[PDB]
Amino acid sequence: LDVSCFAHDKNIGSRTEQLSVVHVASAQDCMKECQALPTCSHFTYNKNSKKCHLKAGAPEFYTYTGDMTGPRSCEHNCSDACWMDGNNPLAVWDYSGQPPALCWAACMGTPGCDLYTFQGMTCKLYSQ
Amino acid sequence: LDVSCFAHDKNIGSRTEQLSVVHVASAQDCMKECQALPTCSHFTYNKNSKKCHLKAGAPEFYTYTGDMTGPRSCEHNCSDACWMDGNNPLAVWDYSGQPPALCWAACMGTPGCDLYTFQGMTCKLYSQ
Numbered sequence: 001l002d003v004s005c006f007a008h009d010k011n012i013g014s015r016t017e018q019l020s021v022v023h024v025a026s027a028q029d030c031m032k033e034c035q036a037l038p039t040c041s042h043f044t045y046n047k048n049s050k051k052c053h054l055k056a057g058a059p060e061f062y063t064y065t066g067d068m069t070g071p072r073s074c075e076h077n078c079s080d081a082c083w084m085d086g087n088n089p090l091a092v093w094d095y096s097g098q099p100p101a102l103c104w105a106a107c108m109g110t111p112g113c114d115l116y117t118f119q120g121m122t123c124k125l126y127s128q
Numbered sequence: 129l130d131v132s133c134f135a136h137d138k139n140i141g142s143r144t145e146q147l148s149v150v151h152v153a154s155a156q157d158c159m160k161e162c163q164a165l166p167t168c169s170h171f172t173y174n175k176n177s178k179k180c181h182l183k184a185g186a187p188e189f190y191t192y193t194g195d196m197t198g199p200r201s202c203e204h205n206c207s208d209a210c211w212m213d214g215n216n217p218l219a220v221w222d223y224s225g226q227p228p229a230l231c232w233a234a235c236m237g238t239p240g241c242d243l244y245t246f247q248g249m250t251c252k253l254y255s256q
């Protein structure tokens with residue numbers, strides 16, 4: 001279980017109410033505990049105390065010595081327009097050399113388009 | 129009327145079916161014609177012929193000598209996760225030093241969150 005996506009040595013804890021507390025030998029075991037609970041979104045593991053705290057809600061970051069905070073999984077890589085349920089674009093177009101406004105124009109002119117993104121040279125259209 | 133957002137000298141036309149054809153003296157007048165029609169999304173104006181073609185649907189770019197293609201307005205600047213109707217985020221958080229996966233985690237753990245974006249240091253949560 002990949003635990004490289006988050007800092008282990010920066011004292012980052014989360015105050016969110018927990019679902020479960022256990023003691024485990026490493027961060028990867030805490031992650032595994034989190035994955036075993038359907039509703040666990042993230043976890044705080046403490047290096048010194050070895051307590052592992054599984055949590056459901058959104059993180060509430062704060063500083064506590066020895067803490068590290070990891071997601072349910074590090075597999076989640078998306079940062080640009082990230083639909084939780086996935087959602088296939090209505091349209092994906094090469095808009096090299098075009099302003100954002102013309103991707104806006106494409107969305108206005110496409111029935112069902114609620115949202116557009118323009119990263120790099122790609123104009124991409126979505127329906128809710 | 130700002131027409132700087134698009135190339136004037138690169139022979140970029142659009143094949144989309146038109147709403148209206150007129151002759152005008154400049155690109156800014158073609159833009160003005162487009163704005164006068166509720167359904168105009170973009171326009172192609174030709175430098176040599178001076179024909180201005182107002183269009184409703186999504187652009188269909190192609191090469192034609194003297195063409196330029198402009199949006200309804202250049203005011204539309206958004207490129208990152210652009211909701212046509214606007215849509216205020218459910219949540220906006222400082223996630224400095226966090227992987228995308230923890231913004232994913234925030235969305236999972238927030239009732240109503242359908243979509244997240246993580247640009248710079250900001251984790252931002254949306255409902256449809």
Ligand SMILES: OC[C@H]1O[C@@H](S)[C@H](O)[C@@H](O)[C@H]1O
Pocket residue numbers: 013014015016044045046051053064067
């Ligand atoms: O590690 C110390 C510990 O403090 C408790 S009370 C928090 O809720 C945990 O997530 C963790 O940060």
Ligand SMILES: OC[C@H]1O[C@@H](S)[C@H](O)[C@@H](O)[C@H]1O
Pocket residue numbers: 141142143144172173174179181192195
């Ligand atoms: O400018 C020549 C002209 O060609 C017609 S037939 C297209 O639909 C116009 O948008 C424009 O590209």
Ligand SMILES: [Cl-]
Pocket residue numbers: 006007008009010
């Ligand atoms: Cl580290």
Ligand SMILES: [Cl-]
Pocket residue numbers: 061062063
């Ligand atoms: Cl703090």
Ligand SMILES: [Cl-]
Pocket residue numbers: 075076077078
């Ligand atoms: Cl992913």
Ligand SMILES: [Cl-]
Pocket residue numbers: 092093094
């Ligand atoms: Cl294309």
Ligand SMILES: [Cl-]
Pocket residue numbers: 110111112113
């Ligand atoms: Cl529509």
Ligand SMILES: [Cl-]
Pocket residue numbers: 134135136137138
């Ligand atoms: Cl130019």
Ligand SMILES: [Cl-]
Pocket residue numbers: 189190191
């Ligand atoms: Cl072409």
Ligand SMILES: [Cl-]
Pocket residue numbers: 203204205206
């Ligand atoms: Cl804007």
Ligand SMILES: [Cl-]
Pocket residue numbers: 220221222
């Ligand atoms: Cl904050």
Ligand SMILES: [Cl-]
Pocket residue numbers: 238239240241
């Ligand atoms: Cl939900």
